[PDB]
């Protein structure tokens, strides 16, 4: 009932426990649109409801937090989601974004190119991805687990996400990956979150909350995407823009979460408990350095 006054709807746990088979996604309100406040872009609204939803989780929020945002360019050459993330994150939060095509951003640093050209040696406290190739929307061919940028994203998490860090990765019915679902079980908690403003879309954000570096539970990613579609197909979500009008509690609470540098041996059950509760980040606190690989070629003959 009251879902319309939420920022959105998370996949209920009972649907996560099922063992459904993959069906085509058929949403009754497909095509319908939410009524946005005057002059507000869909992507600002969408990122705002996502951040409102994240305010209800146990995100680690250290001093000198580090956030990286993939797929942040739009078809208009600006970065609306990045602007929302920066409004949300505490002032001074290091924010890096990237996209395949050139765009103008409020991020502290921006890297243009395929995400695989992106390297950093630093770990990150929060990874956000809106990468999406709309060609993977073909309803005339089987809906298989997809690779491409999702393969980079799986590796970036295992390699570059600090312990206790969190992620939100955009998926759709056809833009999805089985290993990323599997990786969700390497966090203390996970969900698929549908924003109320885009509830007519099969989009969701796969949210992993407080990364533990290891499987906590075993997830078959093929089965779970089927469970997600099953949830969507049987639980129509009413399009709502209601949460966008109340911004008074929007800023991410600066928790001063502690940062420690530890080895794989020093990760005991006490540590893991604190990770799981959003009270600990494990990574170095060195300087942040990023780079973009550049292919060099001379076409003159």
């Amino acid at each position: 009932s009251s879902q319309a006054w939420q920022p959105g709807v998370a996949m209920p746990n009972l649907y996560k426990m099922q063992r459904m088979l993959l069906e085509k996604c058929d949403l009754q309100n497909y095509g319908d649109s939410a009524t946005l406040p005057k002059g507000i872009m869909m992507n600002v609204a969408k990122y705002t409801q996502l951040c409102q939803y994240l305010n209800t989780l146990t995100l680690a929020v250290p001093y000198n937090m580090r956030v990286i945002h993939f797929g942040a360019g739009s078809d208009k050459g600006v970065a609306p989601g990045t602007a929302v993330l920066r409004q949300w994150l505490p002032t001074g939060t290091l924010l890096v974004d990237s996209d395949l095509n050139d765009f103008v951003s409020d991020a502290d640093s921006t890297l243009i190119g395929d995400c695989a050209t992106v390297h950093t040696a630093n770990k990150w406290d929060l990874i956000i991805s809106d990468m999406y190739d709309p060609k993977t929307k073909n309803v005339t061919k089987e809906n298989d687990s997809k690779e491409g940028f999702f393969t980079y994203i799986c590796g970036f998490i295992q390699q570059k996400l600090a312990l206790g860090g969190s992620v939100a990765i955009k998926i759709t019915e056809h833009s999805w990956n089985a290993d990323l679902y599997k990786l969700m079980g390497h966090f203390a908690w996970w969900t698929a979150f549908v924003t109320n403003v885009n509830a007519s879309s099969s989009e969701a954000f796969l949210i992993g909350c407080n990364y533990l570096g290891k499987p906590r539970e075993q997830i078959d990613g093929y089965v779970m995407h089927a469970n997600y579609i099953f949830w969507r197909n049987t639980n129509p979500i009413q399009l709502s823009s209601y949460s966008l009008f109340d911004m008074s509690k929007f800023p991410l609470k600066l928790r001063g979460t502690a940062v420690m540098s530890l080895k794989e041996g020093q990760i005991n059950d006490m540590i893991l408990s604190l990770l799981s509760k959003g009270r600990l980040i494990i990574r170095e606190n060195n300087r942040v350095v990023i780079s973009s690989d550049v292919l060099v070629n001379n076409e003159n003959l």
């Binding site: 002059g39 507000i40 872009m41 600002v44 208009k76 970065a79 602007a83 409004q87 911004m247 929007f250």
Partner: peptide, 21 residues
């Protein structure tokens, strides 16, 4: 066009350029 308008409370300080809306 496509200046990025933010959602906010519209009860802020009114200053011209700021770190948050």
């Amino acid at each position: 066009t496509n200046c990025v308008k933010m959602l906010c409370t519209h009860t802020g300080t009114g200053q011209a350029i700021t770190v948050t809306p």
